[PDB]
Amino acid sequence: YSLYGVSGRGVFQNCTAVGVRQQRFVYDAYQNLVGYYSDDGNYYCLRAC
Amino acid sequence: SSLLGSIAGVGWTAGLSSFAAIPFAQSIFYRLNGVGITQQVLSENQKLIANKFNQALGAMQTGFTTTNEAFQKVQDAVNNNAQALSKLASELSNTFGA
Amino acid sequence: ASVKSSQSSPIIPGFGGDFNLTLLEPVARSAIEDLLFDKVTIADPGYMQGYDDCMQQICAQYVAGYKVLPPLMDVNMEAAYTSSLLGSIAGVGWTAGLSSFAAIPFAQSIFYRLNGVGITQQVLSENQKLI
Amino acid sequence: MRLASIAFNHPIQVDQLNSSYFKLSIPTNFSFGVTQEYIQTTIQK
Amino acid sequence: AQLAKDKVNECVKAQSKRSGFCGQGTHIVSFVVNAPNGLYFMHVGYYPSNHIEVVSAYGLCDAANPTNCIAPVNGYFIKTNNTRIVDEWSYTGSSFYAPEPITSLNTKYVA
Amino acid sequence: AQLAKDKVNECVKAQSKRSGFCGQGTHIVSFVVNAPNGLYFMHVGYYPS
């Protein structure tokens, strides 16, 4: 993928359902994003390489 | 499991290891005859001890969490090497540098 | 907790007749323990007299910074563990099992401890003592 | 809250007799058994 | 791990007539199960808990002086001279509870 | 400290029919006093000569 200001390499899946949903990432306690948003409008949660 | 097999006969001894096949009950009446030096008249009259031994092992079944270190030492070990591995590797990457 | 468990003599000014034991508490930190606490050079500690005592003038309580915590046990109580341990020297040194025993005088404890491995049997320790 | 207890020690002190006899503290009940310590043997590799 | 090998060869095979290591009490059995990364022991020890102070000697003698005391635990109580020692109490006339060492002081019973 | 517990349970309670650890000679008595930070032993051994 290559999203807005963020790079990265991930395996998106239609996951559920944890986030903010108004701004459009979700991190897990580090710099990484685990990982949905951005698609319109669904939960494409990402993973590491 | 072969070590649990050798608990009874090897706990006899009379040498490690060139022995044996003795039932576990008699192994604890000789192991109990040894250092808890109560000789044979007490273990004859009576047993149950057996129910006290099994009661001891029963509380040994129920009690692991949380106030029973050794067990907190075990999760200090798994949380030790899991902490070092994954958490130190999470400090190593993302982020360190300038 | 793997020191004491059982069972002192207790501490009476006569331990063994006649083995002059310095390890008696005079009364609380026995005499040989007093020698190896006086001769060792510690500039520390402060527990509501040494903070103020250094304020009247090591700096675990002035940089802060670093800070030394107290050692979980007051000295009278570590002295209580090892003094009941000195109580259990005689009877526990017998044995015949650790620990479900005893109260035997210290002199006879060293004639059995001496009978054991310095395997001189009873005729030598009878004739004579002084040892 | 409710600080400062000093809970030590206290061993069941058998008393020392004087003469040819000497007291001894033998017990009455077995009461076995404990779980005990982990000994760590390795790392994760 | 070398300590664990020292705990398996001592406390698990044999008894081991030694204190903690074989934790807290006169050790009886010990069991080994594999824990995460290590072994794990279930040391089955004795725990006395009801102490009754009785009286020794130290042995016996008579008009003739061969002694008794001890195989291996003490005394020789009173009422009358009985011998279940460590841990519970008390046996019969001794008959196999007695080596016969040399006499000592406090004569005839035999301290 | 686990060594000290091994020296109290062997050399201090029992005799201990073993060499140094229970230093230098067929061991007889041993005494424990609290030193700074540690224990301290006064092992009373035999010395033939």
Interfacial C residues in 112-131 facing F (CB < 8 Å): 113-114, 116-118
Pairing state of beta strands D23-26 and A44-45?
A: unpaired
Cis before E72? omega within 30: yes
Whole-angstrom distance, CA of residue D34 vs CA of residue B57: 8
For chain B, helix, strand, coil in percent to 5 are 60, 0, 40
**Chain E residues with beta carbon closer than 8 angstroms to that of C7:** 51
The C-alpha atoms of residue C67 and residue C117 are separated, in whole angstroms, by 49
Contact C98 E72 (CB under 8 A): no
Specify the DSSP element, H or E, that contains C11.
none
Backbone angles phi, psi at E53, to 5 degrees: -80, 115
The beta-carbon neighbor of F36 closest among C23, C40, C85 is C40
Measure the CA–CA gap between F5 and F12, rounded to whole angstroms: 10
CB neighbourhood size of C31 (10 A): 13
CA-closest candidate to residue F33, choices C104, C41, C80:
C80
Asked if residue E75 lies in contact with residue D24, where contact means CB atoms within 8 angstroms, the answer is yes
Tokens representing residue E28 in the block? 């009886």
Q: Quick one: which of E56, E92, E61 has its CA closest to E73? A: E56
**Hey, are the CB atoms on C117 and F5 less than 8 Å from each other?**
no
Minimal-distance CA residue of chain D relative to B60: D35
C123: tokens are: 């005729």
What residue in B sits closest to A31 (Cα-Cα)?
B94
E55 beta partners: D23
F45: β partners: F27
Chain E residue with CA closest to B30: the answer is: E28
Structure tokens at E76: 């020789």
Distance (Å) of CA E73 to CA A7, B26, F30: 79, 22, 22
| DSSP annotation of F32 | B
> Resolution to 1 decimal, in Å?
4.1
Per-residue exposure over B63-81, b if at least 16 CB sit within 10 Å of its own CB, e if not? eeeeeeebbebbbebeebb
Report the distance separating Cα B36 and Cα B52, nearest Å.
Answer: 15
Q: Which residues of B touch E86 (CB under 8 A)?
A: 36-38
- Type and span of the H or E element at F29: strand F27-29
E73 to chain B, closest Cα gap in Å: 8
Q: Measured between alpha carbons, how far is C28 from C80 in angstroms, rounded to an integer? A: 7
Distance CA C3, CA F36 (A): 17
AA identity, residue B39:
Q
Q: Please name the residue of chain D whose CA is at the shortest distance from the CA of residue B36.
A: D30
Residues 6+ apart with CB under 8 A from C42: F36
Q: HEC profile for chain E?
A: CHHHHHHHHHHHHCCCCCCCCCCCCCEEECCECCCCCCCEECCEECCCCCCEEEECCCCCCCCCCCCCCCCCCCCCCCCCCCCCCCCCCCCCCCCCCCCCCCCCCCCCCCC
Tell me which of E2, E10, E17, E19 to substitute to probe the interface with F (most F C-beta atoms closer than 10 Å). E19
- Per CB-CB distance under 8 Å, the chain D contacts of E56 are 21-24
A13-14/F27-29 β-pairing = unpaired
Pairs of residues, one from chain C and one from chain F, whose beta carbons lie less than 8 Å apart: 72
- C-beta separation of C102 from E74 below 8 A: yes
Task: List all residues 6 or more positions away from C13 whose beta carbon is below 8 Å from its beta carbon.
Answer: C24
Under a CB-based contact definition with an 8 Å cutoff, are residues B81 and B88 in contact? Answer: no
Q: How far apart are the first and last CA of chain A?
A: 11
- Looking at residue F10, the DSSP 8-state letter turns out to be I
Contact at 8 Å (CB) between F27 and F45? Answer: yes
Cα distance between residue A39 and residue A33, in whole Å: 15
| Closest in C12, C88, C103 to D24, CB measured | C103
CA–CA gap between residue C116 and residue C128 (Å, rounded): 17
- Please, what is the Cα angle at D22 between C84 and E47, to 5 degrees? 55
E110 touches E60 (CB < 8 A): yes
Q: Is D9 exposed, middle or buried (0-12, 13-18, 19+ CB in 10 A)?
A: middle
Using the beta-carbon criterion (under 8 Å), do D24 and E46 form an inter-chain contact?
no
Q: Which residue type sits at E55?
A: V
User: How far apart are alpha carbons B69 and D37 in whole angstroms?
Assistant: 7
For residue F46, what is the nearest residue in chain C, using CA coordinates?
Answer: C118
Chain D contact present for B89, CB below 8 A: no
Chain D residues in contact with C102 (beta carbon < 8 A): 14, 22-25
B42 with E36: Cβ contact below 8 A = no
Q: Which residues of D touch B59 (CB under 8 A)?
A: 33
CA of residue A48 relative to chain centroid, distance: 11
Q: Both tokens of residue C72?
A: 């979980």
C61 token code pair: 């309580």
Please give the helix or strand (H or E) that residue D4 lies within, else none: none
Burial of D36 (0-12, 13-18, 19+ CB in 10 A): buried
- The 3-state DSSP class for residue C108 equals helix
Phi, psi for D16 (deg, rounded to 5): -90, 125
Nearest to A6 by CA among B98, A46, B96: A46
Q: Quick check: C94 contacting E, CB < 8 Å? A: yes
Closest CB to D14: pick one of E4, E37, E53. E53
The beta strands (E) that lie in A1-49 are given as: 13-14, 44-45
- Name residues whose C-beta falls within 8 Å of residue F46's C-beta, 6 or more positions apart in sequence: C117, C118, F25, F26, F27, F28
CA distance C85 to B97: 56
User: For an interface test with C, which of B37, B38, B39, B42 has the most C Cβ atoms less than 10 Å from its Cβ?
Assistant: B37
Q: How close E47 gets to chain D, by Cα (Å)?
A: 5
What is the three-class DSSP state of F45? strand
Q: Which amino acid belongs to residue E25?
A: G
Residue B77 structure tokens: 């070990």
Dihedral of alpha carbons B35, B41, B42, B46, sign: positive
Experimental technique behind these coordinates: cryo-EM
Please give the Cα distance from E12 to E43 (Å, whole number): 9
Where do we find the tokens 């273990």?
Answer: B43
Q: What kind and span of H or E run contains F28? A: strand F27-29
Give the residue from chain D lying closest to B67, CA to CA: D35
For E26, the closest chain F residue by CA position comes to F9
3-state secondary structure of C79: helix
Contact at CB, C95 and F9, closer than 8 angstroms: no
Pairing outcome for strands E52-55 and E44-45? unpaired
